[PDB]
């Protein structure tokens, strides 16, 4: 045991130098620029539809491109899409495995997909010349829970699993295309970037990993955190990304810099983050907690900006329309509201 | 109201269909148990399987007996974290913990020094012992009790209890281990263990199993008129 | 595939009562509602009556209501048609349609083949002023049709149908809402229109474009079809 020793110096004073470099670069703090713009005032956002049906826990929720169309999984073993204009339910998908864990929508609006403890990805078919939804696809390759999932085209989805790996699949073959084996720990949760060449994941090992989707190389890799992360989302512009862990904070890295810019925890906060996003513009980050309401954040700021309440139970998932007109919240209280 | 143009209206109506679709369906899963299966690999989890019911994942396994519906949750095939999926199960009717009883002279292949019945006595008291499950009722298994018999005599049961005093009487061995179990709960108000040995009974396991779901639904029922 | 089949009609004597029945395949037949479609021997089509899926809704036309009764089979995949007190107007080819509504479906898509019944011895208006425009393959031609009632609704829906009937061949759904191509129709066809004028535009016309083009409104529940115009070559 002599040449494992030398390797574990030499990984050593590689991340000596990293640390270095980064320190080198980190000439000035975003929040000592950024005190000299004005600040946004108190948000004051109210319910607006609230959306019943769903028996059981709420674990996953994911818009449609349109803005109106949105889908959410339970562990009452449905896969239920909602019209928010109407508060309508058009679909009802019950799963053969009711464990489900993550849900996705595809950019098309042609496919829906779930997973969760049985190691498998879903997918369904939501128009056919029947008058039915049914299964067009199961991906069998992970030997872990699958954490999340996400569309790259109708042809392409990316999975996050609890194997410690993430893998990209080729729907039409049902085969891994590429594998992703960076982690050391479960991978709870992934971003997908607007153009849909990189993606960011988190993992329990208090991580997160950029990684290039052609190539299927780690890129960078993101520290700062204490405990497991589980949510992860890019800023809108593409260039930086937020996390949030269980260590009740949250935290904004950029890409180009390599390193962490602004954290945003409270004292009186203690409870982990389940769920994570950003506006359309950017200045506002939205986040989940345990404490069963959601706080809005400045994120240039990192001063809190407004509350979000009315769950009874833990705020599991959230996600913001992509024209920035509404957000969505999902609890364990089986219901989901739409705010505005 | 007359708001509503005609494919509106015609959507509503498809929206309470599926509403009743849903409603149906939710009040025939509420009328079953569910029931999470736990322990080694070897403790016997498969012949306790077996007995009820006379490639990787989750496991789940359905019977009847005197008109009601189990189905059991077999997470033995996840070898992830347990605690980033174990509040999924909050809201069980019982837990079923399995413990072979002929595991206290025999040691795991990953460390000779640890003995797989500590190893039993560590899960069972982080199961017990957690904030998800402060409510729900534990069945506890003890299952090679012949082979206990039989290797009570030659290997004597201090070597897995160092301050061990008693003899090497059968069913005071059993006592004792029965004993050491029962003591990890700290609740001991809001939790209760059901304890029985089997090896080979037929149709004793389902019975136990079914009069200890019986004792949990009826303190159950006495929390909704609130005397309980 | 997707199969609608009815059977029944032949010859009937003036106020006797005969039921016509429509047998489904290939899709799910209990998700659907249900439409009664009418053909003369020469004039254009005419709504029935509908029923809805769960059978809670059923609506009939003015001139067939308590005459007519509808009725579906949903373990069967049958729908049923009793008519009583039959007149000498009621001789026509008798369709059967299918239609689902939620957010972004596709109402009235399938048309099943009809069967002929012979007899011996306010309501929105549709408008198709031309009957008859001659062409020519390659020409970009435009068919019109105007509604006395504006069809835009206040949720930004304009209700508005196009459908085509090839000679010897069942009605098949180009446009619905005004402006969505359905999903086997080719992309030479366009739809536009605003409120109360409206047209269908069909460019590169090929050979199999000969027919007989109506225009239908979906707002009000007497729905209405538009005297047919014709393209021949």
């Known amino acids: 045991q002599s040449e494992l020793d030398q390797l574990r110096q030499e990984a050593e004073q590689l991340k000596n130098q990293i640390r270095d470099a980064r320190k080198a670069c980190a000439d000035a703090t975003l929040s000592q620029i950024t005190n000299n713009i004005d600040p946004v005032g108190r948000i004051q956002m109210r319910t607006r539809r609230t959306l019943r049906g769903h028996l059981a826990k709420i674990y996953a929720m994911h818009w449609g491109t349109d803005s109106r169309l949105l889908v959410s999984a339970s562990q009452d073993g449905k896969l239920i899409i909602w019209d928010s204009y109407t508060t309508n339910k058009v679909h009802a998908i019950p799963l053969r495995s009711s464990w489900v864990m993550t849900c996705a929508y595809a950019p098309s609006g042609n496919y829906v997909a779930c997973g969760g403890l049985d190691n498998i990805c879903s997918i369904y078919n939501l128009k056919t010349r029947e008058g039915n939804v049914r299964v067009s696809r199961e991906l069998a390759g992970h030997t872990g829970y699958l954490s999340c999932c996400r569309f790259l085209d109708d042809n392409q989805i990316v999975t996050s699993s609890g194997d410690t790996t993430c893998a990209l699949w080729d729907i039409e073959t049902g085969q891994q295309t590429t594998t992703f084996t960076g982690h050391t720990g479960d991978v709870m949760s992934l971003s997908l970037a607007p153009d849909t060449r990189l993606f960011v994941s988190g993992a329990c090992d208090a991580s997160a990993k950029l990684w290039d989707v052609r190539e299927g190389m780690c890129r960078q890799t993101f520290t700062g955190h204490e405990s497991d992360i589980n949510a992860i989302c890019f800023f809108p512009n593409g260039n930086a990304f937020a996390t949030g862990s269980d260590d009740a904070t949250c935290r904004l890295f950029d890409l180009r810099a390599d390193q962490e810019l602004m954290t945003y925890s409270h004292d009186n906060i203690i409870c982990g983050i389940t769920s994570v996003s950003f506006s359309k513009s950017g200045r506002l980050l939205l986040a989940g907690y345990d404490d069963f309401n959601c706080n809005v954040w400045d994120a240039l700021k990192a001063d809190r900006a407004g509350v979000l309440a009315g769950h009874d139970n833990r705020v599991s998932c959230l996600g913001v329309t992509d024209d920035g007109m509404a957000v969505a919240t999902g609890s364990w209280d089986s219901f989901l509201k739409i705010w505005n | 109201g007359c708001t509503l143009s005609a494919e509106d209206k015609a959507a509503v109506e498809r929206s309470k269909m599926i509403d009743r679709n849903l409603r149906e369906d939710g009040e025939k899963a509420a009328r079953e148990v569910k029931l999470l299966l736990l322990g080694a690999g070897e403790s016997g989890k498969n012949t306790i399987v077996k007995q009820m019911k006379i490639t990787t994942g989750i496991v789940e396994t359905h019977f009847t007996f005197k008109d009601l519906h189990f189905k059991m949750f077999d997470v033995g095939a996840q070898r992830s974290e347990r605690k980033k999926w174990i509040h999924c199960f909050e809201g069980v009717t019982a837990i079923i913990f399995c413990v072979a009883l002929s595991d206290y002279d025999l040691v795991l292949a990953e460390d000779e020094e640890m003995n797989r019945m500590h190893a039993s006595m560590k899960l069972f008291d982080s199961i017990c012992n957690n904030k998800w499950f402060t409510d729900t009722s534990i069945i506890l298994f003890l299952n090679k009790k012949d082979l206990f018999e039989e290797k009570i005599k030659k290997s004597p049961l201090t070597i897995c209890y160092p301050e061990y005093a008693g003899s090497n009487t059968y069913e005071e061995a059993a006592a004792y281990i029965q004993c050491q179990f029962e003591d990890l709960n700290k609740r001991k108000d809001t939790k209760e263990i059901y304890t029985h040995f089997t090896c080979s009974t037929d149709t004793k396991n389902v019975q136990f199993v079914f009069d200890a779901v019986t004792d949990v639904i009826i303190k159950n029922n006495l929390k909704d008129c609130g005397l309980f | 595939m997707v199969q609608l089949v009815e059977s029944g009609g032949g010859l009937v004597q003036p106020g006797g009562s005969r039921k016509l029945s429509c047998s489904a395949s290939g899709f799910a037949f209990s998700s659907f509602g249900m439409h009664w479609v009418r053909q003369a021997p020469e004039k254009g089509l005419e709504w029935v009556a509908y029923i809805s899926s769960g059978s809670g809704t059923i609506y009939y036309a003015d001139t067939v209501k308590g005459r007519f009764t509808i009725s579906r089979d949903d373990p069967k995949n049958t729908l049923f048609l009793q008519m009583t007190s039959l007149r000498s107007e009621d001789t026509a080819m008798y369709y059967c349609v299918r239609s689902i509504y939620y957010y972004g479906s596709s109402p009235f898509d399938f048309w099943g083949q009809g069967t002929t019944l012979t007899v011996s011895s306010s309501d929105i208006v549709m408008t198709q002023a031309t009957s008859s425009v001659p062409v020519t393959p390659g020409e970009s031609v435009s068919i019109s049709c105007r509604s006395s009632?504006?069809?835009?609704?206040?949720?930004?829906?304009?209700?508005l149908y196009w459908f085509l009937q090839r000679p010897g061949q069942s009605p098949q759904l180009l446009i619905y809402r005004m402006s969505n191509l359905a999903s086997g129709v080719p992309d030479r066809f366009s739809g536009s229109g605003s409120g109360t004028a409206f047209t269908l535009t069909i460019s590169r016309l090929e050979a199999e474009d000969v027919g007989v083009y109506y225009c239908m409104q979906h707002l009000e529940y007497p729905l209405t079809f538009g005297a047919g115009t014709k393209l021949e070559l």
């Open positions: 009632k504006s069809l835009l609704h206040s949720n930004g829906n304009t209700y």
